[PDB]
Amino acid sequence: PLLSASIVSAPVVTSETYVDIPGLYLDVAKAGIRDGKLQVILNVPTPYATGNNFPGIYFAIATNQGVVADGCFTYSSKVPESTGRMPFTLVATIDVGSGVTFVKGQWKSVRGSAMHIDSYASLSAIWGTAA
Amino acid sequence: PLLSASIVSAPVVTSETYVDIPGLYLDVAKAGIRDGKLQVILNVPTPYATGNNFPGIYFAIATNQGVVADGCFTYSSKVPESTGRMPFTLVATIDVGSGVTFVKGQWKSVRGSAMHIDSYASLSAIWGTAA
Amino acid sequence: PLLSASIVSAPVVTSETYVDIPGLYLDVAKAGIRDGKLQVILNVPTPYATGNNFPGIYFAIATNQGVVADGCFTYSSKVPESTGRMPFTLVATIDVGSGVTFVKGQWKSVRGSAMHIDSYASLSAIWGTAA
Ligand SMILES: C[C@@H]1O[C@H](NC(=O)c2ccc(-c3cccc(CN)c3)o2)[C@@H](O)[C@H](O)[C@@H]1O
Ligand SMILES: C[C@@H]1O[C@H](NC(=O)c2ccc(-c3cccc(CN)c3)o2)[C@@H](O)[C@H](O)[C@@H]1O
Ligand SMILES: C[C@@H]1O[C@H](NC(=O)c2ccc(-c3cccc(CN)c3)o2)[C@@H](O)[C@H](O)[C@@H]1O
Structure with a gap:
């Protein structure tokens, strides 16, 4: 009943649309x-964004039906002095x-941001059924 | 065994006390x-706070017995240049x-902050019983 | 099937190595x-770090086998004006x-940071077995 996938990095990209991590x-x-419910957790504990205009990253959970x-997250400065990690x-x-x-x-860029994962990140689900 | 509620917005408010989202x-x-345990997750992935004095928001999980x-989160500047999203x-x-x-x-204001949800937020529980 | 531990504070420390919270x-x-899978959640919703060089804290989930x-998180300024809470x-x-x-x-220091928990934090697990 527990599903899990995890990574430690991803190629740095930009995207104006949601694209698979x-x-x-x-x-x-x-x-x-094939039935019941899944409680899904997307956990990106250490991302950062690089960009010129208040950077950030959009994250989604999606199925074959699309984004659920x-x-x-977004920084609070136009060009952060250092792009800190934002769980x-x-x-x-x-x-x-x-x-x-x-x-x-x-993931999707905020305002053109390059998107960075260079350490652990996970996707987790628990399956629950009324049967 | 999986319970879930989700929203995409809430009227902007301030509060010196915890008030329902x-x-x-x-x-x-x-x-x-009526018995067993619930593992509860409050997930507010995209809030922001507006205010004049290092803004932020307190969030709680509560039952009919009160806050458990x-x-x-709070910003690191007195009046952020932009109030970024703080998962x-x-x-x-x-x-x-x-x-x-x-x-x-x-939710409760930090230092008078107006509290903003304008996108997905969730409350989730998994029920576990020793029986 | 639900395990939980929670705290409201910890003595402030620094560490160059992961040390138990x-x-x-x-x-x-x-x-x-003794078998199956555990979905573990470490939840530190209100930490802060103090330090002189872009402070932050590393957090880990560990077993008797080590860090899994x-x-x-890290701040985006060398010496934040105020060290805000970083969920x-x-x-x-x-x-x-x-x-x-x-x-x-x-937990482990980022760049020498003193590590602060002075409010609720939790460690949670759900046990799932194919049997
Ligand atoms: C962009 C800057 O990134 C720096 N961190 C790293 O360059 C780095 C390289 C590997 C890791 C890293 C992270 C989390 C778990 C682990 C352990 N696998 C490793 O971090 C920050 O210190 C700084 O504040 C900035 O955000
Ligand atoms: C206060 C500013 O808010 C801006 N975002 C938005 O104005 C906005 C409007 C809808 C959304 C939004 C969010 C998350 C998921 C989705 C998709 N439903 C939509 O964001 C930030 O870019 C900026 O850095 C600041 O924090
Ligand atoms: C370092 C500064 O810390 C301040 N908060 C507190 O001094 C404080 C003391 C108790 C608590 C606190 C937190 C979360 C839940 C609860 C309720 N048990 C209580 O916060 C911030 O407001 C500020 O922005 C800075 O980060």
Whole structure:
């Protein structure tokens, strides 16, 4: 009933759209889970953003149906003196009965920001069923 | 065994006391849960605070018995150049056997701050029983 | 199936190595859990760091086998005007079958920082077994 994927880095990218964070992927269908609920946690404890205009990163939890939940961090200065690490966690509960076969973490730039993961990050789920 | 409530906004308020975040409410009694433990996650991934004196927000998890756990974020400048988004997660485990009928997220101003949610936020619980 | 430990303070320390956060300890063996998986959440919602050189704190989840996962927060200024509270959550899933008898939260200084907890912090686990 516990699913988990974790990474320690990702190639630095920018994106104006949500794009997969490589490695943060849970295959629900492959685990034989076809109904009930998943409580999903995207945990990016040590990201940073680089950019010229109050940098930050949007993160999402997505399924094959798209983004279920999202949020961001942003710095409080236009060009931070140093881009500090800004812990980020997002939590969503999904109905698998809706047609879900996978869960992924995604990211999007804030204002053109380059997006950095260079240490542990995780995607976690707990499956709960009323049966 | 998985409970969830989520919002995308709340009216902007100030408060010197913990006050409910509208919509972040789980009715435990209504789910027929009267004993065991709940692991509760309050997830406010994208809040900001506005104010004149090192702004921030306190968040709590509360039951009908009151606040079980709380914490805050605060900015590192007196009047931030821009009030950046400051991800916030709080996690507490409650004994339902103690007399619990609901769980809520609450917020309180730091130093007079106006409190802002204008995107996804969640309250989640997993029920665990030794029986 | 739900384990939890929580604190409201810890003596202020520095460390160049990961050192236990007193009180954030889960005894897995004592609970008779010897296989399956644990989804562990370290939740430090209100820490701050004090120091002279872009302060911050590293946090880890560790077992008797060592650190499984870690991350940090850091400020974006060399000597913050005020050291604001920087919420921190870390999530990891552990195989108990690997030889695990306890789970702990740990911390390490960033750049010599003194490490501060003076309010609620938690260590949480959910045990999941395929049996
Ligand atoms: C952009 C700057 O990044 C610096 N950190 C690192 O360069 C770094 C390199 C490896 C790690 C790192 C992190 C978390 C867990 C671990 C352990 N695998 C390792 O951090 C910060 O100190 C600074 O404040 C800035 O944000
Ligand atoms: C106060 C400023 O707020 C800005 N963001 C927004 O005005 C905004 C409007 C909708 C959203 C928003 C957030 C997270 C997920 C989603 C998607 N539903 C949408 O953000 C920041 O960029 C800036 O750094 C400051 O903090
Ligand atoms: C270092 C400064 O610390 C200040 N907060 C406190 O001195 C304080 C003392 C007790 C608490 C505190 C926190 C969270 C939950 C609770 C409730 N038990 C209580 O905070 C900040 O306001 C400021 O921005 C700075 O970070």
